[PDB]
């Protein structure tokens, strides 16, 4: 491999996907989404893999917003130590496991949020 990062990044994805069967790929090698159910509550963990990744931290968001000690002040963006410790020597899949595991300890609660996104622009994928 000419570049270590591209080979390393692939190692991260195959491990994460393998760890999580439910995990669904939204964007090839760029966006991963894992659904999590707790207390009859369904949430979805969104994962972003920037070009810099894994040399850079990923962007993780939760919808709908929940009230947790790992939830940012906005209650929309995720900012936890698990994520902070993110590094090439750390298994991204493990981080995801930790996020929902924390919820298991204490189920999430819908927190106040905006009625809609600033540029809410999303349409159905359609049949094809």
Curated annotation (Swiss-Prot):
State its location(s). Answer: Late endosome membrane; Nucleus
Q: Which family does the UniProt entry place this protein in?
A: Belongs to the VPS37 family.
Task: Give the gene symbol.
Answer: VPS37A
Residue range from the parent sequence: 21 to 148 of 397
Q: What does this protein do?
A: Component of the ESCRT-I complex, a regulator of vesicular trafficking process. Required for the sorting of endocytic ubiquitinated cargos into multivesicular bodies. May be involved in cell growth and differentiation.
Q: Quaternary structure?
A: Component of the ESCRT-I complex (endosomal sorting complex required for transport I) which consists of TSG101, VPS28, a VPS37 protein (VPS37A to -D) and MVB12A or MVB12B in a 1:1:1:1 stoichiometry. Interacts with TSG101, VPS28 and HGS. Component of an ESCRT-I complex (endosomal sorting complex required for transport I) which consists of TSG101, VPS28, VPS37A and UBAP1 in a 1:1:1:1 stoichiometry.
Implicated disorder: Spastic paraplegia 53, autosomal recessive: A form of spastic paraplegia, a neurodegenerative disorder characterized by a slow, gradual, progressive weakness and spasticity of the lower limbs. Rate of progression and the severity of symptoms are quite variable. Initial symptoms may include difficulty with balance, weakness and stiffness in the legs, muscle spasms, and dragging the toes when walking.
Name the chain's protein: Vacuolar protein sorting-associated protein 37A
Q: Which tissues is this chain's protein expressed in?
A: Widely expressed. Examined tissues include heart, brain, placenta, liver, skeletal muscle, kidney and pancreas. More abundant in liver. Strongly decreased or undetected in hepatomas.
Q: What species is this protein from?
A: Homo sapiens (Human)
């Amino acid at each position: 491999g000419l570049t270590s990062l591209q080979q390393q990044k692939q190692r991260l994805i195959e491990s994460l996907r393998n760890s999580h069967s439910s995990i669904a790929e939204i964007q090839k090698d760029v966006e991963y989404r894992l659904p999590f159910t707790i207390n009859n509550l369904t949430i979805n963990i969104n994962i972003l893999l920037p070009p810099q990744f894994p040399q850079e931290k990923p962007v993780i968001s939760v919808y709908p917003p929940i009230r947790h000690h790992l939830m940012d002040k906005q209650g929309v963006y995720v900012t936890s130590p698990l994520v902070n410790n993110f590094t090439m020597h750390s298994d991204l899949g493990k981080i995801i496991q930790s996020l929902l595991d924390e919820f298991w300890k204490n189920p999430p609660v819908l927190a106040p949020t905006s009625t809609a996104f600033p540029y809410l622009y999303s349409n159905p994928s359609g049949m094809s």
